[PDB]
Design an enzyme around this catalytic site. Structure first.
Site, short mmCIF file in Angstrom:
data_model
loop_
_atom_site.label_atom_id
_atom_site.label_comp_id
_atom_site.label_asym_id
_atom_site.label_seq_id
_atom_site.Cartn_x
_atom_site.Cartn_y
_atom_site.Cartn_z
CG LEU A 93 -54.48 42.88 4.62
CD1 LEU A 93 -54.93 43.48 5.97
CD2 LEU A 93 -55.12 43.63 3.41
N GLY A 94 -50.17 41.30 3.99
CA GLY A 94 -48.73 41.43 4.10
C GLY A 94 -48.12 40.10 4.47
CE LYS A 95 -47.51 34.30 2.23
NZ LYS A 95 -47.39 33.30 1.11
CG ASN A 147 -38.98 39.95 9.95
OD1 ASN A 147 -38.98 41.18 10.04
ND2 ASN A 147 -38.00 39.27 9.36
N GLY A 191 -44.44 35.44 9.30
CA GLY A 191 -45.83 35.45 9.62
C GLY A 191 -46.47 36.18 8.46
CB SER A 192 -49.03 35.94 6.49
OG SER A 192 -50.21 35.32 6.95
CE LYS A 229 -46.67 39.53 12.92
NZ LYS A 229 -45.72 40.37 13.70
CG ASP A 275 -38.33 45.43 11.34
OD1 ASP A 275 -37.49 45.78 10.47
OD2 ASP A 275 -39.24 44.59 11.11
N1 LIG Z 1 -46.94 47.18 9.63
C1 LIG Z 1 -46.55 46.26 9.04
C2 LIG Z 1 -45.99 45.06 8.19
C3 LIG Z 1 -46.86 43.79 8.39
N2 LIG Z 1 -48.20 44.27 7.88
C4 LIG Z 1 -49.20 44.70 8.61
C5 LIG Z 1 -50.21 45.01 7.72
C6 LIG Z 1 -51.57 45.63 8.01
N3 LIG Z 1 -52.21 46.13 7.01
C7 LIG Z 1 -53.42 46.76 7.22
N4 LIG Z 1 -54.25 47.31 6.10
C8 LIG Z 1 -53.90 47.19 4.66
C9 LIG Z 1 -52.70 46.58 4.15
C10 LIG Z 1 -52.54 46.56 2.82
C11 LIG Z 1 -53.50 47.14 1.98
C12 LIG Z 1 -53.36 47.17 0.44
C13 LIG Z 1 -54.31 46.09 -0.08
C14 LIG Z 1 -54.37 46.09 -1.64
N5 LIG Z 1 -54.71 47.41 -2.18
C15 LIG Z 1 -53.76 48.49 -1.69
C16 LIG Z 1 -53.69 48.48 -0.13
C17 LIG Z 1 -54.68 47.73 2.51
C18 LIG Z 1 -54.85 47.76 3.82
N6 LIG Z 1 -53.96 46.90 8.40
C19 LIG Z 1 -53.33 46.47 9.44
C20 LIG Z 1 -52.10 45.79 9.31
C21 LIG Z 1 -51.63 45.40 10.68
C22 LIG Z 1 -52.72 45.80 11.65
N7 LIG Z 1 -53.71 46.52 10.88
C23 LIG Z 1 -49.72 44.79 6.43
N8 LIG Z 1 -48.50 44.33 6.55
#
Ligand SMILES: N#CCCn1cc(-c2nc(Nc3ccc(C4CCNCC4)cc3)nc3c2CCN3)cn1
Length: 290
Positions: A14-16, A18, A20-21, A41, A135
């Protein structure tokens, strides 16, 4: 807090961040595809410095209980204490940065101000715990549904000493300098007032709808000249902010909203508004629009 690794099924990244991912996983202890989807995370390089920082981040998130702060669910680790993982609620619309860019034709100013007000209330709650977020940016704000956003990442968050109203810290690596208050650039001082400066940049981001050439890095790099390399960037940024150079008013942004931004961007740390005053001003504008 009782998650066992054997039952976390990886689904996608879902994310990469600081470094970590965050991954989407299904926690499925009964192995029948009924478990809940959660966000996980982890560190991408488990040095002891990053690990102690990560444990403190976990304790900070576990201590926060607020409608506009992402929910802590627990921790997960392998044999020993290694490969520590933070389990959080999964928010289905992802980061506000991406959500806003994708849905900009359907999100009007009254909705942006609803998000702004929720971010302010989250930040005020942090301040009551004497936490400095450090941040604040739309990439660190998550969307639970079309009416609710949450502060979603606390990797840089620090607790104030009890005897001081700021925290001095300079980490190796690179820093979101285009969201930083001048005293954070020059003296590495972080405070509630520098969070307010960054909040002004967040408000700017929202009202640009994340147009690519309008991002804070794009605008500041144009204002100082795109020749600058490395450390010269920070030096010229400091001098620009010292002469009251500021991000421009975004297209279509009302002057009352741009004035909130410019008051957040006061060089004088003590003249910046509080998060409670920001929420009041935003809510009065919202009520006028409705
Ligand atoms: N803040 C911050 C920066 C670090 N980070 C944390 C998260 C995170 N993402 C999600 N949900 C999420 C994320 C991306 C999508 C995209 C997927 C592809 N299609 C379009 C949508 C959909 C759902 N849920 C979370 C978290 C943390 C706790 N719960 C992501 N990056």
């Amino acid at each position: 807090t009782q998650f066992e690794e054997r039952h976390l099924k990886f689904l996608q990244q879902l994310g990469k961040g600081n470094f970590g991912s965050v991954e989407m996983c299904r926690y499925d202890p009964l192995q029948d595809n009924t478990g809940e989807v959660v966000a996980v995370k982890k560190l991408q390089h488990s040095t002891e410095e990053h690990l102690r920082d990560f444990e403190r981040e976990i304790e900070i998130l576990k201590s926060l209980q607020h409608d506009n702060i992402v929910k802590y669910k627990g921790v997960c680790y392998s044999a020993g204490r290694r490969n520590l993982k933070l389990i959080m609620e999964y928010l289905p619309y992802g980061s506000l940065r991406d959500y806003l860019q994708k849905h900009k034709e359907r999100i009007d100013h009254i909705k942006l101000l609803q998000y702004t007000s929720q971010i302010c209330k989250g930040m005020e709650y942090l301040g009551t715990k004497r936490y400095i977020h450090r941040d604040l940016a739309t990439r660190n704000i998550l969307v639970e549904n079309e009416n609710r956003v949450k502060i979603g990442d606390f990797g840089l968050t620090k607790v104030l000493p009890q005897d001081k109203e700021y925290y001095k810290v300079k980490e190796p690596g690179e820093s979101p300098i285009f969201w930083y208050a001048p005293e954070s650039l020059t003296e590495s001082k972080f405070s509630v007032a520098s969070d307010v400066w960054s909040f002004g940049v967040v408000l700017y981001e929202l009202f640009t709808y994340i147009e690519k050439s309008k991002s804070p890095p794009a605008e500041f790099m144009r204002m100082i000249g795109n020749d600058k390399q490395g450390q010269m960037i920070v030096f010229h940024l400091i001098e620009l902010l010292k002469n009251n150079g500021r991000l421009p008013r975004p297209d279509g942004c009302p002057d009352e909203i741009y004035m909130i931004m410019t008051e957040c961007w006061n060089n004088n740390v003590n003249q910046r508004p509080s998060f409670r005053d920001l929420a009041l001003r935003v809510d009065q504008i919202r009520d006028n629009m409705a």
